């Protein structure tokens, strides 16, 4: 149960993500991310785009139906104080792309936690433009310590939870609609 790994989806919960979170050490801004694939189809990792921060971890390469991937990120170590803000992109075996946004900002005087989930038609890499769409234009969810559900189209739906703090967990379940 480490970041970079896949577990059984039914075992995804706050406990597993907290353990991933706690393993990163005392850093101001950091995130544990778990995405449970119940979509009926296998996911293959494309890439992650980091608008801010980074990860030492490889995206789990293959994530089968019934499995959850565990991932994490943290703020830049270097001289520029950043949050951790990015987009994970997975290829689904229908030819389409599952994209997940997380934003855990540095400066809470101006910003707060957000996340989003969207299915993109065809094969699309995570990048700056994708981040802008998901952050500014596709109705992202607040990290408000509550669950939010939404149809993704393609017969899939998402149910997800993100906490409100700079020590952030993001838990998402992708199911059949």
Ligand X SMILES: CCCCCC(=O)OC[C@H](COP(=O)(O)OCC[N+](C)(C)C)OC(=O)CCCCC
Q: According to the binding rule CB under 6 A, does residue 95 interact with ligand X?
A: no
CA 61 to CA 42: how far, in whole Å? 11
At residue 102's C-alpha, the angle toward residues 96 and 106, to 5°, is: 155
Cα separation, 29 vs 84, whole angstroms: 6
Query: Measured from the CB of residue 38, what is the shortest distance to ligand X in angstroms?
Result: 27
Nearer to ligand X, 26 or 109 (CB): 109
Q: Is 103 in the site for ligand X (CB under 6 A)?
A: yes
Distance CA 51, CA 44 (A): 22
1-9, 55-63, 110-118, 149-157 -> range binding ligand X (CB under 6 A)? 110-118
Does 132 bind ligand X (CB under 6 A)? Our answer is yes
Q: What angle is formed at CA 12 by the lines to CA 107 and CA 90, rounded to 5 degrees?
A: 70
From residue 5 to residue 44, what is the string marking binding to ligand X with x (rule CB under 6 A)? ----------------------------------------
Instruction: Name which of residues 63 to 82 contact ligand X (CB under 6 A).
Output: 80-82
Distance CA 102, CA 168 (A): 10
Q: Which of 8, 10, 47, 111 binds ligand X (CB under 6 A)?
A: 111
Q: Is beta strand 30-37 parallel, antiparallel or unpaired with respect to 167-176? A: parallel
Site residues, ligand X (CB under 6 A): 51-52, 80-83, 85, 103, 105-107, 109-111, 114, 132, 135-136, 140
């Amino acid at each position: 149960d480490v970041a970079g790994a896949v577990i059984d989806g039914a075992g995804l919960g706050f406990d597993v993500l907290k353990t991933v979170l706690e393993a990163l050490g005392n850093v101001k801004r950091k995130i544990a991310v778990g995405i449970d694939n119940e979509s009926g189809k296998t996911w293959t990792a494309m890439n992650t785009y980091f608008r801010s921060g980074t990860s030492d971890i490889v995206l789990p390469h293959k994530v089968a139906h019934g499995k959850a991937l565990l991932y994490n990120g943290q703020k830049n170590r270097g001289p520029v104080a950043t949050g951790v803000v990015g987009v994970i992109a997975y290829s689904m075996s229908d030819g389409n792309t599952l994209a997940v946004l997380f934003s855990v900002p540095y400066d809470y005087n101006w910003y707060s936690n957000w996340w989003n989930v969207r299915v993109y038609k065809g094969q699309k890499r995570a990048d700056q433009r994708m981040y802008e769409e998901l952050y500014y234009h596709r109705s992202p969810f607040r990290g408000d310590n509550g669950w939010h559900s939404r149809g993704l189209g393609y017969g899939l739906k998402s149910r997800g939870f993100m906490n409100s703090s700079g020590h952030a967990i993001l838990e998402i379940h992708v199911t059949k609609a």
